[PDB]
Design a binder for this molecule. Sequence first.
Ligand code: HEM
Ligand SMILES: C[C@@H]1CO[C@@](Cn2cncn2)(c2ccc(Oc3ccc(Cl)cc3)cc2Cl)O1
Length: 529
Amino acid sequence: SIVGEALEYVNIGLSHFLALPLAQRISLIIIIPFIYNIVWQLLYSLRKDRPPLVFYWIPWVGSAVVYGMKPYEFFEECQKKYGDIFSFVLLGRVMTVYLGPKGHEFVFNAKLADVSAEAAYAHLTTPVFGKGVIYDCPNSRLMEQKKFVKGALTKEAFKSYVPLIAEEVYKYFRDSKNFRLNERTTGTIDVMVTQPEMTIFTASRSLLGKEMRAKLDTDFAYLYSDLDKGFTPINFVFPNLPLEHYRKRDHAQKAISGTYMSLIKERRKNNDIQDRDLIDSLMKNSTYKDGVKMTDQEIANLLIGVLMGGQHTSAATSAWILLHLAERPDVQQELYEEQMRVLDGGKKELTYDLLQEMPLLNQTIKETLRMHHPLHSLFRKVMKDMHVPNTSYVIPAGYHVLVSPGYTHLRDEYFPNAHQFNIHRWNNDSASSYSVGEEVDYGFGAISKGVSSPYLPFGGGRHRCIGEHFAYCQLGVLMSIFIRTLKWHYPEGKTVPPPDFTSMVTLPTGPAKIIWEKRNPEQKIGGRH
Ligand code: HEM
Ligand SMILES: C[C@@H]1CO[C@@](Cn2cncn2)(c2ccc(Oc3ccc(Cl)cc3)cc2Cl)O1
């Protein structure tokens, strides 16, 4: 009864392995891991403390291809197969999706020890924005940075911004080659060209100030284009490989951040610290509660983060608003009547107050954000094993949880006819969001305690957006002026493009063109150029 007989042949077997032709070693190095993860998945499927894991053929890659291309379709299939909790493998990671209001509650209100937003995002954002801020710092510092940024975003701030944002829109109509309203009465624009430029011009002028706005009329603008391109989903897998767009990214980050510090330091040494923009505001108020101040570099990187995050959400949203209204002249007609009423047929200048008396305009933003959430997925890295309540599931640490409020936005269950663009579903309900009950404060002010609203455009919980009022102000002024100046429609046989999900921001697949006409061909925008 000898067992060695075989253990010898284990050893012999290993030696015949090392000596196979390289033709076959490569083959074996491919077939053996392939077979291994198919065996592992069938085995994983028997654990009852695990959400179902979407089956996948290629290891490591996982379901990345279909997830990246059509994530909402991927969610609906996996939801029909396995229900509202499931996992799937994604470019090296396991994502545990939790669909629906309960998923919102499980992830957005997760405990600070269970999940980390900075662990999921810092690789994507820190090379773009800079160091020491946002996701390159502990959550407590985040909460106080949001407290600083919010302080420049007050109602009195927004009254200053409305005329500046409006001056910027008119100047863009006057001077941009896509309009030139003093020279042409009709034209064709790509909204994916016009809207990003309008967003940065209005955002720069109002948040950063006139100096920073002015710099975008020079070769400097290309640095924002550079810094923009470093903000790419393959920052999320290959974040610092030594290619050149990784360098123009880091150069633009250094160069842009340098410009803000120059202005900051020049204001402190001229004592020229007013209340004109977010730069004055962060200068006067950026000391943490433990007494540490933000450095001028940390302040500037927080500005890059503000402008950059606002840039992509806002520009995509005004692009969808225009594309949706391009086939709804009835809605343009209704929005134009409200403009005429609230503003005495133009004999009243637009103020932040009159903006709040325009519920149908605000309903259009509301509705566009329901059909086109700019972020289809939000993530956390799981730090501690989490038991999914009223199940037997344990999400072990090292997984990621993925919440997707914009998927629920498109469910007939929660929005009758969810795929119709209908601003009237928000009749007497035009608030950008509503704290439907009890509130909580995480460091940056009282926000809703529950995050179980099926309309959750701005998320909830500690990582909840603080830009919604700024975005409504900016989009509000922009669309008010658009509506009062132009009608617009599609070229023959064109309609609303489908969303290009691969940028992770749900942009219209460009080119997305509209044809605009002047409501008053003979009208002239003033000022010099
Ligand atoms: C249509 C406009 C916008 C939408 C739909 C939107 C959406 C969101 C969402 C869903 C989050 C939560 C992310 C998460 O929990 O994983 C968020 C966070 C945030 N957003 Fe917005 N956003 C918009 C505009 C803006 C603007 C214009 C700004 C700046 C002026 C801004 C600044 C922020 C900040 C600072 C956070 C904090 C993230 C954190 O605390 O980790 N957002 N936004
Ligand atoms: C992955 C993350 C989730 O949300 C965003 C996208 N976004 C959301 N609203 C606007 N942009 C995002 C959110 C905020 C942000 O910038 C700041 C600015 C100030 C503070 Cl105090 C904190 C952060 C940058 C991004 Cl890129 O990406």
